[PDB]
Amino acid sequence: DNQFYSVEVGDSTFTVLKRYQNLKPIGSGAQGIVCAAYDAVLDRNVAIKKLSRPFQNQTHAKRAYRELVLMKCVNHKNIISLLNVFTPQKTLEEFQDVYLVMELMDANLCQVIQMELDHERMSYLLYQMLCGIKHLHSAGIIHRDLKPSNIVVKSDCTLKILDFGLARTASFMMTPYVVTRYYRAPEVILGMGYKENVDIWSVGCIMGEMVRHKILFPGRDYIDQWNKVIEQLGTPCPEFMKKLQPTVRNYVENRPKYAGLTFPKLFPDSLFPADSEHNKLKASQARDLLSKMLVIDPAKRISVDDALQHPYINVWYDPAEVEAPPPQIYDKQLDEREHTIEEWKELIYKEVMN
Numbered sequence: 001d002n003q004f005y006s007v008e009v010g011d012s013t014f015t016v017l018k019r020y021q022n023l024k025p026i027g028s029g030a031q032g033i034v035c036a037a038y039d040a041v042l043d044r045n046v047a048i049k050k051l052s053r054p055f056q057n058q059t060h061a062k063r064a065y066r067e068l069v070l071m072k073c074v075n076h077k078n079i080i081s082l083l084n085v086f087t088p089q090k091t092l093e094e095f096q097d098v099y100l101v102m103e104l105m106d107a108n109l110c111q112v113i114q115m116e117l118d119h120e121r122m123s124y125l126l127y128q129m130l131c132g133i134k135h136l137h138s139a140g141i142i143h144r145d146l147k148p149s150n151i152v153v154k155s156d157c158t159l160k161i162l163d164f165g166l167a168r169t170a171s172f173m174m175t176p177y178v179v180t181r182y183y184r185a186p187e188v189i190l191g192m193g194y195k196e197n198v199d200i201w202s203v204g205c206i207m208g209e210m211v212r213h214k215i216l217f218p219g220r221d222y223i224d225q226w227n228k229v230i231e232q233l234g235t236p237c238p239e240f241m242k243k244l245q246p247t248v249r250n251y252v253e254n255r256p257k258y259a260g261l262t263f264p265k266l267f268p269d270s271l272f273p274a275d276s277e278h279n280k281l282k283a284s285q286a287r288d289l290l291s292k293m294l295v296i297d298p299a300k301r302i303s304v305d306d307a308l309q310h311p312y313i314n315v316w317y318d319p320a321e322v323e324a325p326p327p328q329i330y331d332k333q334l335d336e337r338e339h340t341i342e343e344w345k346e347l348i349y350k351e352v353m354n
């Protein structure tokens with residue numbers, strides 16, 4: 001008898017419970033391969049993510065532990081839920097790998113970004129993103145790292161956020177894997193403190209990219225990225241500059257100036273469905289929401305609640321999906337706590353075993 005079996009996927013072995021059959025790779029990310037499988041017990045398809053030795057460094061360790069605790073305690077239909085968690089290893093000293101089993105979605109948002117979408121779909125996708133984000137914020141969780149690759153959709157336009165972002169705290173790793181910074185807010189890029197609407201910026205970047213079918217602010221690094229920002233949105237005004245630390249403030253001033261394009265120029269009508277009157281109007285509303293989300297200074301950038309109330313969005317509004325009961329978060333030492341790899345290993349083990 002063994003509850004598990006082993007099969008090779010790419011340069012990896014998945015050792016999984018026997019209920020999970022017919023594994024096929026569906027994606028890859030910073031902590032390895034994700035597979036689709038049929039779950040014979042629930043009689044339905046699932047997704048299975050393997051974490052290889054997540055305690056191997058502080059960064060993987062903190063993310064893995066945080067994602068476990070949060071996926072368990074968070075209950076919302078726009079945030080991916082955990083069906084099952086397991087390790088095939090029998091003891092702490094043998095412990096190597098964690099397997100996360102989630103409901104299976106059909107695609108990530110990068111694939112949606114490569115297609116044209118009507119306004120009904122686009123606005124519903126954004127409505128769901130905002131609901132999820134609001135639910136996180138209600139629990140004290142500010143993501144700060146929303147990106148298309150960590151957001152998934154089904155064929156029926158339902159949407160789920162995969163991860164819980166960066167902890168309020170604090171990260172070196174020897175790797176080929178390059179982190180995507182394109183969707184990060186100015187206040188993150190310039191480390192100036194932030195609030196809830198730091199996540200609106202990322203939504204605007206995704207919405208903009210949904211319309212333009214191009215990454216809004218591509219850069220090799222944060223210098224580039226900041227240039228790309230100011231050369232489309234224009235150099236921010238003085239009352240913003242005043243809130244930067246003198247070392248970064250100094251630097252932002254001395255950048256070559258741009259007054260910046262306008263939203264009709266940034267997002268012309270030829271990008272939008274605008275054949276009918278319905279679509280002409282929706283196009284106008286979309287551009288308007290964009291212009292309130294892609295605002296450099298967060299004191300003047302629209303909030304989550306006001307974004308949910310915007311005419312482009314509020315057609316979907318429902319007090320069940322917004323205003324849901326916040327998660328419990330039984331830990332509360334969670335976002336910030338530091339440990340050795342040996343300690344992280346046991347933390348993670350305990351959580352996998354409950």
Ligand SMILES: Nc1ncnc2c1ncn2[C@@H]1O[C@H](COP(=O)(O)O)[C@@H](O)[C@H]1O
Nearest residue numbers: 027028029030034047102104105108149
């Ligand atoms: N639950 C899921 N359902 C469908 N695809 C997923 C799921 N989880 C992860 N993926 C895919 O795997 C890729 C990387 O996963 P992650 O590294 O978890 O973002 C994502 O961009 C998705 O394409």
